Ligand binder design. Structure first.
Ligand SMILES: Nc1ccn([C@@H]2O[C@H](COP(=O)(O)OP(=O)(O)OP(=O)(O)O)[C@@H](O)[C@H]2O)c(=O)n1
Ligand SMILES: Nc1ccn([C@@H]2O[C@H](COP(=O)(O)OP(=O)(O)OP(=O)(O)O)[C@@H](O)[C@H]2O)c(=O)n1
Ligand SMILES: [Mg+2]
Ligand SMILES: [Mg+2]
Lengths: 226, 227
């Protein structure tokens, strides 16, 4: 095996996908081989496609998915609306374990938060992470409430002995403001803040994104991942 | 003693205060004596006063605060910015215990979500609930993400053996979209949904808010809250 990291977030819209892409670009610039798996994608009618974003921004080519639901709903709702089950637990876990190899950082992106349902019957990104011995990278906001949400997620992580690889602030505002600055310090009082990605990085081109990403993570940590 | 509920939520801004007021109103109209307690209150320099708002909507007269910070921040941060300290765990529990009385329903509204720090070091409303043996009423949204946040909150409640008294959807839109409807029906499978307060309820005057309040909750559940 190699390094499997699940990339979760305190909620929906915290920039999990942009963090996957950023870590991917950093690791690739460290000469690490990266794969990204997004088992279930919703919102496809309006063009939601987070693996494509990772491809565009980071140049990852090993981009693995199992199901696509048109509706911009939570996976289980989208499944119900479309009239089709979610994938099974086994499909996700073996797709990920077949992606994993020596030398590779394999990022696994869930949908929404940690406890959202990802497969039949009621299995979550947390379960998947258990099944594959992955650590968890927690993407957070810098807004009022982030502390509560972070501690809640880290507590759920620990309840199943999924190790915490750290937090990333998905979007660092400009200019910051009092709340975001104080929250950044507190977040660092509960876990290793690995990076804070400038607000708007998503819209960068691949070159500028690569420069941002390179400077956003500690190089030794990135290298030390695999 | 009497009955104590901490009234918590999946985050900040979900309708905790309005639920305190609504449940207090329904319980008052059931003849139950009601106290509402707000041990940590931030954002006073912006005119935030949750106790006053409960009194304004519900007529609750037994309102107890303790710590008040000017800035609209996390209590830890608002205290650090005022040059002040957080209360002690026993200060908060004392404030609550002095309110407790047979036949009285004592609602304890927190600062933000369940794991926000109320006292040094890292003391939360969950700890306070264990200390005063209270049950937790969890206010939720109907919006995307509410299932994850709700499950996280319930799981954190069971982590310390704190009973869940049920959920209350703080703001229920009329009409409900596809996501709201789905989230509601899933929430009913995760826990007892005690009420779904209609959106904009803070705009109802005393009588409108009391009517809405009595209809919002099952009369039998409210009455069963207090012997
Ligand atoms: N530093 C950042 C981080 C995020 N985004 C934007 O923030 C929004 C949501 O972030 P996303 O990367 O989509 O993360 P997710 O948490 O995966 O969203 P969800 O799980 O709900 O699909 C996107 O428009 C993304 O383009 C941005 O512009 N600059
Ligand atoms: N059924 C509802 C629910 C909420 N609100 C409004 O939406 C906001 C949130 O209500 P509040 O109880 O203040 O949410 P809390 O979680 O209590 O806010 P805080 O985190 O600051 O304590 C308020 O402006 C309130 O007037 C409303 O009008 N009717
Ligand atoms: Mg995403
Ligand atoms: Mg409030």
């Amino acid at each position: 095996g190699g390094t499997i990291l699940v990339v979760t977030g305190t909620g929906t819209g915290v920039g999990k996908t942009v963090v996957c892409a950023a870590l991917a670009s950093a690791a690739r610039q460290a000469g690490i081989d990266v794969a990204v798996c997004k088992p279930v994608q919703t919102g496809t009618a309006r063009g939601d496609d987070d693996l494509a974003e990772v491809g565009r921004l980071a140049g990852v080519t090993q981009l693995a998915g199992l199901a696509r639901y048109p509706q911009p709903m939570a996976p289980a709702a989208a499944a119900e609306h479309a009239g089709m089950a979610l994938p099974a637990r086994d499909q996700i876990v073996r797709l990920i374990a077949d992606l994993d190899r020596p030398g590779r950082l394999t990022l696994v992106e869930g949908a929404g938060g940690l406890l959202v349902e990802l497969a039949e019957p009621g299995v979550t990104l947390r379960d998947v992470a258990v099944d594959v011995a992955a650590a968890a990278l927690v993407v957070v906001t810098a807004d009022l409430g982030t502390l509560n949400h972070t501690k809640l997620t880290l507590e759920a992580l620990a309840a199943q002995q999924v190790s915490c690889a750290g937090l990333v602030i998905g979007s660092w505002p400009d200019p910051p403001g009092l709340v975001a600055a104080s929250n950044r310090s507190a977040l660092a009082r509960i876990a290793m803040v690995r990076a804070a990605l400038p607000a708007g990085a998503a819209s960068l081109d691949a070159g500028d994104f690569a420069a941002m990403s390179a400077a956003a993570f500690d190089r030794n940590w990135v290298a030390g991942l695999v």
